[PDB]
Ligand binder design. Structure first.
Ligand SMILES: *SC[C@H](NC(=O)CC[C@H](N)C(=O)O)C(=O)NCC(=O)NCCCNCCCCN
Length: 144
């Protein structure tokens, strides 16, 4: 996996209440790293739009979303991630969050960066705006 250079400290990611998801289940997909936090109103307001997009398109367009949390506390993470249907980098992997923030040049939230799982190549850094501008995914994955 292609993405293994982006997970130095977590071998499993979250889905719902579990922590049994491994990286091979992302083979062949585009993976969107979603930088967000509940303390940020703009981020909170973008999340539902991304939820509708995910329900409409995740299967047909073969993508996954992974929350990379800038939340303030373990409790805030738990409550905010519980609103989401997709994956998350575990909160206790703070170092891994900082690694990805630096690696994808994330200076603000919400930010959504799409990567090809098999190569690890960044495909798009504009997915936040394009989920809003292209809600039917006509031009997905919006390659930069
Ligand atoms: S809620 C957190 C904030 N996000 C926004 O305000 C939303 C931005 C935009 N309208 C959008 O909707 O995407 C956020 O992520 N703030 C963090 C941040 O931007 N810090 C970077 C500050 C860098 N300042 C540079 C100063 C250099 C001067 N020489």
């Amino acid at each position: 996996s292609g993405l293994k250079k982006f997970f130095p400290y977590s071998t499993n990611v979250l889905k719902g209440a579990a922590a049994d998801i491994a990286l091979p289940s992302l083979a062949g997909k585009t993976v969107f790293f979603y930088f967000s936090a509940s303390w940020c109103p703009p981020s909170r307001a973008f999340t539902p739009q991304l939820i509708d997009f995910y329900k409409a398109h995740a299967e047909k367009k073969n993508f996954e979303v992974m929350l990379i949390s800038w939340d303030e506390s373990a409790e805030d993470f738990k409550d905010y991630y519980a609103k989401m249907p997709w994956l998350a980098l575990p909160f206790e992997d703070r170092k891994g969050m900082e690694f990805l923030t630096t690696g994808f040049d994330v200076k603000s939230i919400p930010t959504l960066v799409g990567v090809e799982a098999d190569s690890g190549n960044i495909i798009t850094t504009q997915a936040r705006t394009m989920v809003v501008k292209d809600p039917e995914a006509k031009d997905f994955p919006w390659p930069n």
